[PDB]
């Protein structure tokens, strides 16, 4: 029932959806473009994971306007989802410490 945990879970499922949609749409956006490397779905999912975690190796990246806009959506969704998990951990710790000191 606690809001922070349900929001964390929601953010997790939303992130999975964004990774899958970003993989699909990045391929869709990049295949028009000579030299583009983000053009098959298995490595595009890998790219979407590294973009969502900000763990970005430089092995793949978009070169088109629409692929970069897809990238921005994946970045913000990833950073926001992990920040939400952090915030829920803090809420849990704060509650448990209020209990441990009897408040």
């Amino acid at each position: 029932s606690a809001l922070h945990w349900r929001a964390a879970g929601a953010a997790t499922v939303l992130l999975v959806i964004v990774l899958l949609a970003g993989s699909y749409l990045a391929v869709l956006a990049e295949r028009g473009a000579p030299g583009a490397q983000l053009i098959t779905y298995p490595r595009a999912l890998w790219w979407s994971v590294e973009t969502a975690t900000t763990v970005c190796y430089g092995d793949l990246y978009p070169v088109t306007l629409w692929g970069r806009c897809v990238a921005v959506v994946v970045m913000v969704a990833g950073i926001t989802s992990f920040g939400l998990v952090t915030a829920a951990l803090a809420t849990w710790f704060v509650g448990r410490e209020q209990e441990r000191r009897g408040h």
Partner: antibody
Amino acid sequence: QVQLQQPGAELVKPGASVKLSCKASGYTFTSDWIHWVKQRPGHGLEWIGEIIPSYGRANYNEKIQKKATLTADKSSSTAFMQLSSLTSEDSAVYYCARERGDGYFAVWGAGTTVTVSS
Amino acid sequence: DILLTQSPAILSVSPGERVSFSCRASQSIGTDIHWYQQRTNGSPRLLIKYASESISGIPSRFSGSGSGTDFTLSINSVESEDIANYYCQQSNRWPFTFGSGTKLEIKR
């Protein structure tokens, strides 16, 4: 069952146009691309373009004159290539092929021999 | 756009021999090379994907190797049904491109 079905032949007068078809069976997925490849007698394979039926977007070989226009019909699982204003340079076998979005042509149609003649 | 050079354009071998086809990419493309066989009057047929991975229903004498710019398709003990044109194809960068093809000939 044969995965991609195309007609054996089409006869086209110079300057006219023709719509080739490629009917797909077997598993279909949202990540499927249909490619078209041109082969002139005694020569190699030349990539023409691709279409993703699930979304309808098509891309074309930039290095050659655009004579193709690719479409797809999801209800009939059929991909089409409209070749426009053909000359004898356009006589060839045109293959379709299916790529599961992982970069290789898993399966090819039997090819349509197009002859441009009066 | 990535040029794939297949040289020599014709390979002549004796039955039972091991033969090797060469494909060189104009830039580094990892293992994103695929090989097709086309017999006379036939449509192309995938033999090897991603430089070395087997395809179901392809005789085991076919193998592939290489990474980067240099790729080899090998046949152990050539036989008659292997007489064909052999093409490589890259999927590393848009657009996909094909090599110009190597014909296999048998000296009987």
